[PDB]
Motif scaffolding. Sequence first.
Motif, PDB file in Angstrom:
ATOM      1  N   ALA A 194     -20.599  29.586  25.882  1.00 53.86           N
ATOM      2  CA  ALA A 194     -20.956  29.881  23.848  1.00 53.86           C
ATOM      3  C   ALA A 194     -21.075  31.643  24.372  1.00 53.86           C
ATOM      4  O   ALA A 194     -20.981  31.933  22.892  1.00 53.86           O
ATOM      5  CB  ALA A 194     -22.090  29.281  23.879  1.00 53.86           C
ATOM      6  N   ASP A 195     -21.755  32.232  25.608  1.00 52.28           N
ATOM      7  CA  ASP A 195     -22.327  33.757  25.264  1.00 52.28           C
ATOM      8  C   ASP A 195     -20.887  34.588  24.936  1.00 52.28           C
ATOM      9  O   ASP A 195     -20.592  35.289  23.891  1.00 52.28           O
ATOM     10  CB  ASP A 195     -22.233  34.356  26.061  1.00 52.28           C
ATOM     11  CG  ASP A 195     -24.029  33.985  26.337  1.00 52.28           C
ATOM     12  OD1 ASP A 195     -24.355  32.724  26.123  1.00 52.28           O
ATOM     13  OD2 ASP A 195     -24.611  34.068  27.437  1.00 52.28           O
ATOM     14  N   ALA A 196     -19.852  33.902  25.674  1.00 52.65           N
ATOM     15  CA  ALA A 196     -18.664  34.686  24.463  1.00 52.65           C
ATOM     16  C   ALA A 196     -18.266  34.302  23.536  1.00 52.65           C
ATOM     17  O   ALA A 196     -16.689  36.152  22.901  1.00 52.65           O
ATOM     18  CB  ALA A 196     -17.708  34.816  25.842  1.00 52.65           C
ATOM     19  N   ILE A 197     -17.813  33.745  22.922  1.00 52.67           N
ATOM     20  CA  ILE A 197     -17.599  33.131  21.605  1.00 52.67           C
ATOM     21  C   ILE A 197     -18.158  33.543  20.538  1.00 52.67           C
ATOM     22  O   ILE A 197     -17.966  34.376  19.529  1.00 52.67           O
ATOM     23  CB  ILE A 197     -17.459  31.744  21.210  1.00 52.67           C
ATOM     24  CG1 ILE A 197     -16.369  30.893  21.876  1.00 52.67           C
ATOM     25  CG2 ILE A 197     -17.467  31.074  19.978  1.00 52.67           C
ATOM     26  CD1 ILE A 197     -16.025  29.890  22.215  1.00 52.67           C
ATOM     27  N   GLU A 198     -20.286  34.059  20.768  1.00 53.48           N
ATOM     28  CA  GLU A 198     -20.584  34.281  19.456  1.00 53.48           C
ATOM     29  C   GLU A 198     -20.228  35.697  19.840  1.00 53.48           C
ATOM     30  O   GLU A 198     -21.034  36.328  18.277  1.00 53.48           O
ATOM     31  CB  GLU A 198     -22.641  34.011  20.926  1.00 53.48           C
ATOM     32  CG  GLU A 198     -24.010  34.780  19.757  1.00 53.48           C
ATOM     33  CD  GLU A 198     -25.179  33.993  19.420  1.00 53.48           C
ATOM     34  OE1 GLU A 198     -24.816  33.949  21.310  1.00 53.48           O
ATOM     35  OE2 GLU A 198     -25.925  34.165  19.217  1.00 53.48           O
ATOM     36  N   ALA A 199     -20.369  36.705  20.983  1.00 55.99           N
ATOM     37  CA  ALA A 199     -19.773  38.032  20.581  1.00 55.99           C
ATOM     38  C   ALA A 199     -18.848  37.921  19.881  1.00 55.99           C
ATOM     39  O   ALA A 199     -18.592  39.432  19.517  1.00 55.99           O
ATOM     40  CB  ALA A 199     -19.988  39.024  21.811  1.00 55.99           C
ATOM     41  N   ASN A 200     -17.783  37.438  19.791  1.00 50.83           N
ATOM     42  CA  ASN A 200     -16.621  37.419  19.319  1.00 50.83           C
ATOM     43  C   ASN A 200     -15.788  36.680  17.924  1.00 50.83           C
ATOM     44  O   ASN A 200     -15.367  37.589  17.349  1.00 50.83           O
ATOM     45  CB  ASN A 200     -15.168  37.093  20.596  1.00 50.83           C
ATOM     46  CG  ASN A 200     -15.348  38.049  21.434  1.00 50.83           C
ATOM     47  OD1 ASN A 200     -14.561  39.183  20.721  1.00 50.83           O
ATOM     48  ND2 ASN A 200     -16.041  37.821  22.292  1.00 50.83           N
ATOM     49  N   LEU A 201     -17.440  35.791  17.716  1.00 46.79           N
ATOM     50  CA  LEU A 201     -16.929  35.159  16.601  1.00 46.79           C
ATOM     51  C   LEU A 201     -17.890  35.717  15.508  1.00 46.79           C
ATOM     52  O   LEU A 201     -18.268  36.062  15.092  1.00 46.79           O
ATOM     53  CB  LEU A 201     -17.002  33.861  17.111  1.00 46.79           C
ATOM     54  CG  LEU A 201     -16.781  32.545  15.341  1.00 46.79           C
ATOM     55  CD1 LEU A 201     -15.745  32.030  15.098  1.00 46.79           C
ATOM     56  CD2 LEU A 201     -17.627  31.406  15.638  1.00 46.79           C
ATOM     57  N   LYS A 202     -16.850  35.785  14.486  1.00 51.22           N
ATOM     58  CA  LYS A 202     -17.107  36.499  12.564  1.00 51.22           C
ATOM     59  C   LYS A 202     -16.888  36.199  12.046  1.00 51.22           C
ATOM     60  O   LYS A 202     -15.732  36.358  11.896  1.00 51.22           O
ATOM     61  CB  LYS A 202     -16.740  37.786  12.700  1.00 51.22           C
ATOM     62  CG  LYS A 202     -17.900  38.435  11.820  1.00 51.22           C
ATOM     63  CD  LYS A 202     -17.425  40.383  12.139  1.00 51.22           C
ATOM     64  CE  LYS A 202     -18.525  41.349  13.306  1.00 51.22           C
ATOM     65  NZ  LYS A 202     -19.956  40.971  13.094  1.00 51.22           N
ATOM     66  N   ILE A 203     -16.871  34.698  11.502  1.00 49.82           N
ATOM     67  CA  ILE A 203     -16.320  34.549   9.984  1.00 49.82           C
ATOM     68  C   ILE A 203     -17.301  34.083   9.211  1.00 49.82           C
ATOM     69  O   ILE A 203     -19.388  34.328   9.214  1.00 49.82           O
ATOM     70  CB  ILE A 203     -16.339  32.525  10.500  1.00 49.82           C
ATOM     71  CG1 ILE A 203     -17.617  31.647  11.416  1.00 49.82           C
ATOM     72  CG2 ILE A 203     -14.919  33.121  11.346  1.00 49.82           C
ATOM     73  CD1 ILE A 203     -16.882  30.578  11.484  1.00 49.82           C
TER      74      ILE A 203
END
Lengths: 85, 39, 383, 132, 50, 364, 72, 416, 122, 244
Positions: free
Chosen positions: H185-194
């Motif tokens: 979850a932390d890895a995706i949060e830092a990289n997801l931008k939609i």
Amino acid sequence: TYMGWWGSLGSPKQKYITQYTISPYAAKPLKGAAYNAVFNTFRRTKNQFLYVAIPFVVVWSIWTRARDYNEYLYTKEGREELERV
Amino acid sequence: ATIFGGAFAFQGFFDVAVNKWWEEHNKAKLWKNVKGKFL
Amino acid sequence: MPTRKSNTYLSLVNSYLIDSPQPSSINYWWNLGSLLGLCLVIQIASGVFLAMHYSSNIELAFDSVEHIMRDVNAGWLIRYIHANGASFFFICMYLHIGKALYYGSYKQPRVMLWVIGVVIFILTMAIAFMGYCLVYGQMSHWGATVITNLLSAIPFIGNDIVPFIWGGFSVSNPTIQRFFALHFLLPFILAALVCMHLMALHVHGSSNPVGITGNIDRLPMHPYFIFKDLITVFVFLLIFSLFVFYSPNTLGHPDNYIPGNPMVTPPSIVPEWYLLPFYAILRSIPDKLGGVIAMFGAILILLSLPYTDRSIIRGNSFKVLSKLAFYLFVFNFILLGNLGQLHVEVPYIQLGQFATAYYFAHYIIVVPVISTLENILYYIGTQ
Amino acid sequence: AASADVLAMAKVEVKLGAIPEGKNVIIKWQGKPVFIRHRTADEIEEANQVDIKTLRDPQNDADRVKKPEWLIMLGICTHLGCVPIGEAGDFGGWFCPCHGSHYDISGRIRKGPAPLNLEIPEYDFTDDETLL
Amino acid sequence: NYQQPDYSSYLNNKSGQGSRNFTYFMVGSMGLLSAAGAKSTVEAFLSSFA
Amino acid sequence: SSIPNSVKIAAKESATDLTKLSVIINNAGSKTGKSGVSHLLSKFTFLNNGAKSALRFTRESELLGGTFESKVTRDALILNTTFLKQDLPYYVEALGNVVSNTQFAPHEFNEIVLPTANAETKLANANPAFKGVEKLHEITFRRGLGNPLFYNESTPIKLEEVAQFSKEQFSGENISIVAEGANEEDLTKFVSESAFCYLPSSSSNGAKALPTNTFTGQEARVPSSGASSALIGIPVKPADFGKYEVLSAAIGTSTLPSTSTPLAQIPGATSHLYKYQDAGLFVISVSGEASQVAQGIKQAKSVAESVSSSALSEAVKAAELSVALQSTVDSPLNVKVVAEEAPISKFNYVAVGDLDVLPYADEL
Amino acid sequence: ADPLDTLREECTKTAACKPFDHHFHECIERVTKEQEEPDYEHKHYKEDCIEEFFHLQHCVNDCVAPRLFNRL
Amino acid sequence: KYTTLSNGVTVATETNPAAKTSSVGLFFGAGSRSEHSHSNGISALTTNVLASQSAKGSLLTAKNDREFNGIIAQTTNDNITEAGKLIASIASNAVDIVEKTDLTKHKQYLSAQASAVEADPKSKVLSHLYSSAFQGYSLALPTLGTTESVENLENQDSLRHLAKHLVNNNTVIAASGNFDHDKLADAIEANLKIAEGVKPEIKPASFLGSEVRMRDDTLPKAYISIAVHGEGLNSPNYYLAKVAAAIYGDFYLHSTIAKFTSPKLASIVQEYNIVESYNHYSKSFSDTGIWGYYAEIADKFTVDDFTHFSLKEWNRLSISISEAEVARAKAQVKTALAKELANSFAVTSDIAEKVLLVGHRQSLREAFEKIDAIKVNDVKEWGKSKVWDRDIVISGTGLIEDLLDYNRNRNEMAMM
Amino acid sequence: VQSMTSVVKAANFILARPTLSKIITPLAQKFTAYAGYREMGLKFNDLLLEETPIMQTAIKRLPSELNYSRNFRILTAHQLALSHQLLPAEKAVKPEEDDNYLIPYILEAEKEAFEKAELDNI
Amino acid sequence: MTAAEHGLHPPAYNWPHNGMFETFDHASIRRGFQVYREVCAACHSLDRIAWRNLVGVSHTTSEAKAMAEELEYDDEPDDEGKPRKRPGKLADYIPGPYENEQAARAANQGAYPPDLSLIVKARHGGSDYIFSLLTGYPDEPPAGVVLPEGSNYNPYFPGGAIAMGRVLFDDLVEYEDGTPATTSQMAKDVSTFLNWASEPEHDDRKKWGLKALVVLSSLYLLSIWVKRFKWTPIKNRKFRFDPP
Ligand code: HEC
Ligand code: HEM
Ligand code: HEM
Ligand code: FES
């Protein structure tokens, strides 16, 4: 024979034809019964009338001529012509 | 079956309807209505 | 497999009623066959209930019929059925022949079927005539007398066959009794012929108003054309009731209600209406032998029709000239029927001769000539 | 074929004397209708004069009548049975009413659609009596 | 797969289980009217036996 | 674990609470007996035991919700079962009565086995890729691993042969029970008290394993209708399983269906490293229209070689993924995927379909 | 008086029936004239007014029929 | 386990230490059901374009379902977090990736797939059945679009599709395998931008009993399918519909167990070998379903017999199903559910489908408890409601001359 | 039935002579338009009496595309007759599309049959 | 034939029993039977009608029975062989005035008055004809026609000469219900009674016909609906042909 059973009715190899249909219980029955039975029936009668009318006119003209001649023969004025026949 | 019994419903319904309409349309002509005059 | 196919009896019933792959484009005319079958039942059914009360003795035939009408509970209904139902049997048979003549249902793959058709026709006429003779009214008796006198025209055996028919020296008790027996019987021979008709139909199936092959689109029969058969059957029964219950004697002749008396001929002799056309043909030819031969030819030439019809296209639905020829033939047939009931008078003798001439000319000239002309016209027009 | 019961009655009988010089009395003969007549003097003579050749039918009155005045004719007016009418037709003798055809006093198929002479019912006669 | 023909006009306005119920009603009515007619005819014919 | 018969038992927890029990007859596969015996044997496995007939065992199993199959592999004959965790004592017992005292009745050999085996063979061979792979194994490992995987009428087999191959096989040393999601102690108890306890330790008069004898440089051609297929096969030692798993995943492998790989850029192409106990076969296949395959196989050959060592190393993780995917309960896999270069020059070639179009090995 | 005779009397006086009654009456007169000559018995064709009478009676029946049973 | 990140996107993961391999994927709903005839197949094309990106060692694949789409990056357990970032990147740069894309090659790939689903007889039959059943609505459209519509798609169409459907409220990050949920979850949060946006309204669909017949006399068998309006993922009868389907189960004539399979239909069709194979299914969409069977008949003269017997066995559903059949169906449905949820890829797809289309996913133990609550009377009530005498949709491909027209099969649905 | 050999013989007998050609051909087109089969999608050769061994052979030797087009046209004609409706003028078969596609195959069949009959009576 | 030979065609009087749903005017049947017994029984037989046929139609059972006793019938001769006679009963058929056709011809100048039990179904015009015949006698025969001795002119009789001669005259019968006895009224009554005698099933026949029409018309409408409904799938088929 020229008509087998359902599996092989003798129809040529049929292909690429897709037949769509809807169920009953989900289609308007007698959808255009009232309007069609008038307009389309009139159209069919118009197309097919002459074929029945020309023969009918000819035959009924012959019949009318024969009937009128027969009625004329058996009258006080048709007695002479009846005798001549 | 229920076909046998149900046929009675329709047969009786139509029979009574007609045997009640007929002796009303023709009441002036039937025997049972005219016999009084000649008795 | 389903019980409707595993069992041989139900298998037959299925092959003929439930899964018979009828073409999808058949009109209501194709229902006539069923009606004919229905009528065959009715003729038999009411028929079997009339023989239970009909007494075939010549001195009892007419009185027995009147006993049926007046004394038996529903006897009036049974007699009016058995009679008007015969009239309707012939209405439906003439319509079934007219349909087979308009659409080429008599052409190649079904010629055999057509043949049985004709035989049925012939046989039926006999039955009907014979049954009519059972009433032994004036017209009944004198129709029998005229028929046997005409059959007395066979070259050599004619003088000897007639006593075998009459069973005596004139239409009398033996004649009526044998007519009753053969009339009770021949309907079952006709049922066998109808079974043969259905077999010859099932071998190659039924035709189409368009004439083209139906194999590309065929429908079962249980949900389709059985419920069309019901429309046709109920229309048939509704008209049959309009006749049987209201004006049941319209189709018959009043003189048939006068008990037969050989010593007084009625003013005019006419068969029952459906045999009038052929009767007219019989009178159009002066010679008695010529007349009987011409009449039986008028019935049998249907056999020649499938070979004189040189049409490459089955049926008339797409043919201009052939439709005119067909309707002209139908109206001339009605004209012959009309002339059958009319007295042999000045214009009518010539008119009947011409009508018979054209009736035979149809089959032996017009159908071949018109079919060939239309084949050539089709090919030339498309090119 | 004819039951022997029907063949019995093949020959009937008749009381010839009662009928008048000018009357026609139909009776049933050979189990069939028959026209029985006694010839009128003028009618008998008229027939003797009439030429057989003139008629299409090849028959003559002299062969048709066994006993001169009393002669027997079968009832059917036409070759195919036509109920016989009385005193009508080409000569005013009979009308084949079933087709309105004309039957002569001879009984031959004179006019109409007629084919052959009315068969003299094969017969023999005794005094004022007849058989047929 | 593909675009079907539009049946909008052909579609019935009535309920899914209701129209079949009405079809049942009339088919059964036809069956029982036919049964009544057959009863009348058969009774009339058999009454001749009496 | 093991029992006095030396029947190995392996048990480990499972994700989806199904006891995917499976029995691996070590060397009763298509390599051991005469061509096609193992297929018929696999078809006889679950039919008639000495305890429950086919129509009884199948009905009971379906009531219990479990599934069972018998698949033939060139190394081992695998009897897979899959059932809810509550159902272990039943199926395990059944499996015992499958390995021991299977009836092998002639009426099953003629009604349920030969017809079914022939149908399966025809269905499988209708696929040109599978026919090509069978031919590739035939010409690469002439005997043993090259035996046809399925029964073929060209090598008639009589019931006595299948029965005598069940016996003289299925021995304690020759079967390895593997389960996923079943306690190893409970499974050991059930196996010990099942029919597995009665199997002999080793076959007295069979199971003389032969050497692999890999052959290379060969080729074959198998004319076939419909779709065509050209295949290239590298025999590989077991110790090389790591090199080629990395190579296959580098160019594109059947286990990893994905675009963007060099081999996925050409229609119908794929690769796969079939792995066996004592040898392996790396197969690069192309399938489809004959004209398309003609160029496709040459492109695939040129792709397999000339794969950048950097991209090969990048493919190490994908190869590890592929190995993890392949390592099912029945086919345990232990291959260390290294990026070491893998040669291709020693390839066998097989063509199927329109042989007038497909190239010869001399055209690569 | 019976309704039928009065209906015939009314109808024969109608305009439609008038020409038929006319023709019938002069036919009667003509036939009586023919009967006046002494040679009448010898005439082959002895005229009669059957046809005119039939025409008159048909044209009168076509009028009386629909109305008569309203009188009874 | 659920965690709604910033942007409101939800990360749902089903981690199991026994998982052989890990998977993580971004799914943004709006499959073919969200398309229309002119632009059909655009969702599949967009997902293929996104899934064709550099995988960085993972296995990036497209989903392309009827109602939802997504890209799944399978990978071994320890690498999962990297894959996470990957897909996040692939979705934070989705518009850029589409813009820089030459859709030619991807469009021939999608056209090849569309031809594939129109050649595999079962795929063609089922696609045609779905199209005819829901004709007139977007749900009728192919999942992968038609060859005629795919070639007519352009980059701007895919960009519009992404802008409409690739929004936080309409997207879910599903995962499974053996890993710490918080790390992913932390890895995706830092990289997801939609982009932000409201969840697109899901288009309506209504079942319409119909028949479609693609008769190709050149094929060797008759591939038919017959189904009724089933149960959608929301309906509480979902598992009940599956149990009803499993009561009749599968059948393959040449399989060894063909002579021993429990279902009565299997014993019925083997007397004359009426059918070669069949399989009963309960396809469930977001709100509507198709419950029926697919079948392949080898003998062209016995299609009618198979349809008759299968519909009679359906009639048995509302009257005479025994506790043995119900218990067998329950057990088989439980086993099938557990089989469908073994592979981490399948678990991720299931999590995405459920979370997007029903909002909540019933754990496998809850599903087992819900199935075990089914009694025979519940199954018969469902048969009365949904199977007994309900309109059917039919499809067929080859040698279907013996498949009698609609009315016969429809009337078979109510004869005792 | 009349053989296509004889039908074509008569048609070429007429077409060769300018007077008969001018008189008939307009009448031939008028008759074929009034026939009304084109309004149902049928070409002329679809109407031919299929139920004969010669004609059955002729269809059995048609190309694939012509065979499928014939199947579809026959099915459309059956449906139109079934529903008692006709094709609009724009959808009907135009005179130029009535191209006599099946005649050559029937003529070949009749040529084969006639040669066989002649040689059997050599 | 000539118009005279065919006989003037009787018109169509709107009888109370013409329409599809009207019965006989049983009052008229009783009055017609009265006129029959009073006038027609002198010459006409009317054999096929038994007194029992009149119960519930025009006479109560007591009246028919009483009318039966008023006549004598031949019974089985006594055990001594002598002829015996009995008073009539309901089962007995109405007796004609003549023992045989010979007697009837002798008593009517050779003309044979036909049995009237079928005279309505044995004539072209039916009831109308009878009416037109009984009131068709003109006071003066049309000029020029000469009748054979004993014959009276009636245009509606084929040939124009009928041996009957007018019988119905004004006030010839005193009706039991006080109805006036005009000749037209008597003719209508006699025609109606003879029509009943020739068609005793008329009322029952038409009632059964009404029931049958109701049933069959409803059933035919139902069949129309069912057929159109079950054919909607076929008439709604839509095809496509999409070759490459
Ligand atoms: C005394 C004698 C009577 C009486 C009181 C009635 N009739 Fe009539 N009838 C009579 C004769 C001599 C004849 C001979 C007929 C003939 O010359 O052809 C008849 C005949 C009839 C007919 C036949 C009509 C026809 O055939 O066209 C009918 C009908 C008839 N009679 C009926 C009838 C009726 C209803 C009477 C009511 C009182 C009636 N007759 C009286 C002699 C006599
Ligand atoms: C297709 C077959 C038949 C046809 C067309 C037919 C037709 C006729 C006709 C038209 C009549 C004239 C009756 C009348 O005018 O009153 C008649 C009389 C009669 N028929 Fe039939 N009939 C058929 C079969 C049968 C059968 C199977 C029987 C079995 C008993 C039968 C029994 C009678 C009897 C008894 C009469 C005497 C009429 C009567 O007494 O009223 N008929 N038939
Ligand atoms: C009792 C009498 C008859 C019965 C029951 C009967 C039965 C049938 C039936 C059931 C059909 C199929 C439905 C239809 O095509 O209308 C049929 C068709 C036919 N009928 Fe009859 N038939 C009878 C008499 C006749 C007669 C007398 C003829 C001709 C003289 C005839 C000629 C035909 C032909 C040729 C067909 C085939 C029609 C086609 O395929 O287009 N039938 N018949
Ligand atoms: S009347 Fe003598 S032929 Fe008919």
